UniProtKB/Swiss-Prot annotation:
Protein name (record): Proto-oncogene tyrosine-protein kinase Src
Residues of the whole record sequence present: 258 to 533 of 533
Organism, scientific name: Gallus gallus (Chicken)
Post-translational modification: Dephosphorylated at Tyr-257 by PTPRJ. Phosphorylated on Tyr-257 by c-Src kinase (CSK). The phosphorylated form is termed pp60c-src. S-nitrosylation is important for activation of its kinase activity.
Domain of life: Eukaryota
PTM annotation (Phosphotyrosine): residues: 166, 257
Sequence positions that bind ATP: 16-24, 38
Modified residues (S-nitrosocysteine): 228
Amino acid sequence: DAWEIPRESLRLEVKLGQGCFGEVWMGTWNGTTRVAIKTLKPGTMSPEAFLQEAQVMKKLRHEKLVQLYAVVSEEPIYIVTEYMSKGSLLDFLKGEMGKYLRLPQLVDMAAQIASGMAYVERMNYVHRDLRAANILVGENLVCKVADFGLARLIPIKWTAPEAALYGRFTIKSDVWSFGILLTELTTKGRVPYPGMVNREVLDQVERGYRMPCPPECPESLHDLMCQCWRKDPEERPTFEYLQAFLEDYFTSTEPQYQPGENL
Ligand SMILES: Nc1ncnc2c1cnn2CC1CCNCC1
């Protein structure tokens, strides 16, 4: 790969996370470009298994997908990507900033993530783990889809039933997850299905249960969520449709919107 860079060119500065996969750092590339750097522990995971997230990232390029910059392919492995200054969308919604986010910023964020996924749709990829913990936020409220560790070319509260039960993962099961993501945005990052354990969630959703309209969220936005949660996967809307609806929301759908205490 022309993706390869020399080890001298990477300076790992501040640690940002741990795991069984390894760890993630903020750093510099070529002493100029700020970057996110992902480490594998040479022992714990397969080298080929860790490198697969990068393999898929080489083919995909879009302004709302976190961009690969470089790799170090030999053990110890490093994966260099663009640095997203504000952490995961989940931490952003739950944190100091969440207090001031109102519906117009939240729906814009939704529109951006929809655009990223529309690209994934057009390329015939599936993400399979779309949720606020796997979206990253940059300067100026930019949201980008991250973490294609599971993403192929054909977490039960975020997973569509047909996927969780029978392994049928498609772009339409991603659309379900997007519905769940809309509730994370509109509740400031609260865990979906509050007070329900996982075993209870599978049961309920199979029997037709769906989350109610979150406090102060317009019913038209809840109705979009319910479209993303249709039992029949092929009756769920496309990411191209969702992008456009969200982009146009405040003119076409909710032109009379007024600010409230939380949304
Ligand atoms: N590209 C990135 N920029 C900034 N932080 C990052 C990344 C990639 N991963 N991380 C670490 C976050 C830290 C918050 N929890 C989700 C993972």
